[PDB]
Design a protein around this ligand. Sequence first.
Ligand SMILES: O=P(O)(O)O[C@H]1[C@H](OP(=O)(O)O)[C@@H](OP(=O)(O)O)[C@H](OP(=O)(O)O)[C@@H](OP(=O)(O)O)[C@H]1OP(=O)(O)O
Ligand SMILES: *P(=O)(O)OC[C@H]1O[C@@H](n2cnc3c(N)ncnc32)[C@H](O)[C@@H]1O
Lengths: 988, 76, 291
Amino acid sequence: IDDALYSRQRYVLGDTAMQKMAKSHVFLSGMGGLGLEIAKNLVLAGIKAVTIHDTEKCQAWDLGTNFFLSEDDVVNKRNRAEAVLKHIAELNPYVHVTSSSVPFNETTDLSFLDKYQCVVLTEMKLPLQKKINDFCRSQCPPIKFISADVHGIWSRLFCDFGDEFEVLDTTGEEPKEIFISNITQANPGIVTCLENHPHKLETGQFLTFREINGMTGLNGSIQQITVISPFSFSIGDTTELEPYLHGGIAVQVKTPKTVFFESLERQLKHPKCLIVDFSNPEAPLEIHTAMLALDQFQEKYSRKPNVGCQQDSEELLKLATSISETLEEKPDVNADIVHWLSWTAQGFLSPLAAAVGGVASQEVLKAVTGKFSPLCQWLYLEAADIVESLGKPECEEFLPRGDRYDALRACIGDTLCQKLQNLNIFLVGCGAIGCEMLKNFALLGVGTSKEKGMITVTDPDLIEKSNLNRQFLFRPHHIQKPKSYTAADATLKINSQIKIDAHLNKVCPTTETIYNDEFYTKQDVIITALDNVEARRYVDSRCLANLRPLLDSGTMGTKGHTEVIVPHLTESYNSHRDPPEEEIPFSTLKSFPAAIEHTIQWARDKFESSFSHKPSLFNKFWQTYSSAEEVLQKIQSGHSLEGCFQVIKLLSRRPRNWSQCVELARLKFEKYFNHKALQLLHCFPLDIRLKDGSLFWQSPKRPPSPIKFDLNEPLHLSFLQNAAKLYATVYCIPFAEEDLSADALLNILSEVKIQEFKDERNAIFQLEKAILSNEATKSDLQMAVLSFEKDDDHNGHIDFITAASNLRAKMYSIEPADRFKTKRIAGKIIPAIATTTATVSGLVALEMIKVTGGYPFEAYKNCFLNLAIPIVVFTETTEVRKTKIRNGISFTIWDRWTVHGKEDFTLLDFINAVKEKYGIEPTMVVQGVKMLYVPVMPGHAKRLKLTMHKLVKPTTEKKYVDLTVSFAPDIDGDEDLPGPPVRYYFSH
Amino acid sequence: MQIFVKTLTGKTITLEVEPSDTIENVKAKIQDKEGIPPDQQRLIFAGKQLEDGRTLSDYNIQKESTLHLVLRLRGA
Amino acid sequence: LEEKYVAVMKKLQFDTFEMVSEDEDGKLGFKVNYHYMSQVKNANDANSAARARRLAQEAVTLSTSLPLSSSSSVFVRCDEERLDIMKVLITGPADTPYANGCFEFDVYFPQDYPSSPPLVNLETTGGHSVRFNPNLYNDGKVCLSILNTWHGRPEEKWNPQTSSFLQVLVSVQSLILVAEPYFNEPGYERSRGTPSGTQSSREYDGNIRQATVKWAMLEQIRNPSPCFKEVIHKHFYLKRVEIMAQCEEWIADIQQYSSDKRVGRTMSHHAAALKRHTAQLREELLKLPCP
Ligand SMILES: O=P(O)(O)O[C@H]1[C@H](OP(=O)(O)O)[C@@H](OP(=O)(O)O)[C@H](OP(=O)(O)O)[C@@H](OP(=O)(O)O)[C@H]1OP(=O)(O)O
Ligand SMILES: *P(=O)(O)OC[C@H]1O[C@@H](n2cnc3c(N)ncnc32)[C@H](O)[C@@H]1O
């Protein structure tokens, strides 16, 4: 596995799953939009071989749904499967892609399907699907079956993995670790966890134990638990064992699970649907009935219903009524759903197709690897809210006109399509989500109008090798080029009329000058695809000051979310807090580690301190003062200097050639991994006790043990090599790759001794010795500064970090970790995959239409999803909150007060104006983080007689500034009542 | 009265509450079993987000009702 | 004397000083050494608004409620414009090895305050060469429960509703600078009352006494920080006789254990260092002009 390309995906799937992904063949039928999306996601995932099959030919109608065809393909009337083969193979050269066109019908011999291992069917008549499903599930071993379809704004998904399927990992979450505090020799036994730290377990789970004193029989065994209290649980009989002394660690054990499926024919009479919106739990059954009725109508009349023909709607309603009573549950018939399904039966909505394709690709991965829990057994997504707010539109607005937007026009209507083409949209970031959003915009024709419309995308980063796995707009020959330019060039190929303006700036407070308020006023909607919360908060604050809608999304592994913010209706991003990373307590990190993360963090901090901070301090100190003799003279006169001891110590111990660097590395190894253990044991002996009598070296603390150097061990050699290389790089000492051999290091170290284990005058003597030896030249007062680069495989940073972490872990007798886990933990790499990004991009594109149309508050939705369970939750967005201060005066977060001043306006005049206009008087005026008037602090009493223009010190480009105020509470001793921000104009 | 709180990743939490309790106390009860601070948690019922200051009777939460716990993500 | 000292020092507990000046380009230039320069320069975000209200409310308490007595006192300085920059000076309590010292701290309030506790760092480390206390690491980090966020206990965390900066200051002064700092380390309190524990505590006290005499009085007099120049000058001027008597008593007490074998060499070294420091401290005090 070439990690440079699948670095992100391994953290999600795992080594065994990726091994199983190879040597797998997938058959994909129907090269529509949905089939193309599924094929793209699968090819990006890394399946060994994919076979695409289609029998139709390209038409002008297909240009509006397929993002790989061209006018030439339509002119030449090429087969749809063949015309896309070349472009798809370009996505990943490691995937073997083939095309086929053998006819499918009732008499086709299905014997050839046994070669593959999963079948995905799209755009197929129901009887053929029934026959194929009946054939596939009876093979030994069974062949997995998946069906998907999109009709207008309604979608259907189905899965079938055979009679019995086996899952090797139900949830995919790593097991937790708990510390035992007490055990009881009782039937059943009672186990009490440590103080605080609830076990967070549930009945039926399995645990295993290790490192237990006294109850040695429980070590290595497996038990089934029964939760009793948040801090205790129960295990099997333990009356026959020895009493419990101390210690003990229990870790959860994963267990395979078996699920059962049913054939397609049986499932049509009582489906086990999945609920995605709990406000209408009965919707999926009605949608299922409507889709089944549509299929029956299509079979009966050999055509789809025509838009606006009321007899077709009546016939479809009658068919749905006839079908519904035959179902086992006997549900009701929803007239509205049938009506809208009849209205838009011939349309096609791209974002819904993208979301369904992402979900189907995840299901295919589950089928081939068995990694997660599969879907069971239906899924019904829909976008009815888009058309629910249109009222009763005329049928003429939905008729096709003869261009590439026929499908979208038949879906949503002409007026909303035209309002889409005039959008000015600002997109932040061009990561994985950015490319998908650009593709969806190109398919929707956003901003293609000649008169008005523009798309702005900004990203300062450059293309990297690992980025090609998720972002499909980039190519191997695009490495080390701006992301925005490449994305714009790729998008312009999909739609020629797209107008895109690309920038290279990073949205931050420093660059606020170019992105002034007029620029934000020009835009109509702002979309973010960022990866850190600070930028999200800054962008939300900027949008809040100009009343502009904001759409936000993010993913991590197999989880994702979307959020919608609309002026005067909903709360902003800052109205909720996010979980920050928990800090490791300082003593645990420095002296008492208990897990591999602590040692990895220690190694990272040691690298930073040794190779970044100290060289910077050295350079700064020796650039502050010109000469070393001057420093010596200043020291001899008793003058104090900042950090003098550290820099003079670094100067004294400066190496001169390769051998001294090797010796320094050896001394560092000894000091790090030998003396610390001896010192710690000397301070705290193994048998020391606390007040209550418990041993000091109890859990979670682990006693250390010294490590003896030995060149035969690979770990010691790796640490020595990496440390020597890094020190030689820092001190600018030339070296050759031949010197890194084991023999050369052995020869160098054969004459190096090791010291045994146990200020101003010394510093002056050492500095004078350096002076008299001509070691204080200008070239000697320079050290290179290194920076952490986790993506480089030859700088040696990750090797050094891994070696140090493993050595420290073995010093404290902890299980070591390999290179990839260390890289992930040190670099804080976020795991990611294509399916979730595609799904969230589709959902965001869906919500953008609702934002554009100006729908009421009840139309917007937020989605939190986890495809691993799987589980999807749709909620209404948070309503705005009223806040009052006094006298019945209330305000929302979108409010903003204004005060008009002049050239001679004073602070007292400002206070009086606010008091007169709004009824209350401020008591504290602060501009951002710089205070302007606080009565408590000294000297501010006289500030009431100053010009506001001087008191603010503004820039001439801005004609106004923003201030924050506060008001005195009704009862003294309470915090001041907050108020809305106040904007001050310098002149009329 | 018995209610269930199902968070994403499949973990299920059992709670004891009575009508008339206040949403903020209901969510503070979560901390006793999870350690999650009240200000950091959003909980959803029947497609609506439970706002602070209200009681269970307003949202019409009954026995064996299911509430979801959701969080936002940072990667992109 | 104590009444005069209280009367004089009450006017200097809270004030403002100019630390950061801005040029036409908005760049920040620090006129005094500050430990959190990088975080100040990087975190230019002006989104925070509740922090301003919280600090404005706190300034009301900090102007009058700071401890003040002959034994110990606290002094605070803050920037003329910004609100997230402070410097704190604490004088060591009496009857402790930290007696009559002048210890300086740096305080920075993060953007999301009061959702997170402020950062505190010690500056009188003597160039990172001295570990003054088990809870005061020689690199300058001050370790307290109220300043940390970890599992611990719900009542031993930074609680946004109740915790306040004055609590941090009082906790530092009352819990870190104690009579016998050697026993602050858990795991040693078991051996309290044993002769070995007494000997170890005496050695630790001797080291701390010499360290504070060197780096808490002499260096502060010679190179005072610009913020607290007047405070230091008026503090040392008014208590020269007590300082001399205390130093003589400390020198006398240490030599009582020079005849021991286990710790005799360490005690002799500490006594020599203390004598060398006191010799120069006498000259420094005699030359101090009247404020
Ligand atoms: O500068 P740091 O990264 O905080 O590391 C220091 C440093 O060790 P290295 O320079 O070898 O990395 C100290 O040595 P000096 O440079 O100050 O001489 C050493 O002090 P000792 O030599 O006296 O052991 C101290 O260790 P300690 O605090 O245990 O005295 C150790 O700190 P860490 O290794 O824990 O970071
Ligand atoms: P994911 O990490 O895959 O992609 C995120 C991309 O967004 C860019 N980015 C991060 N932060 C910013 C800001 N503040 N402004 C503009 N662009 C940003 C990253 O460079 C990634 O390309």
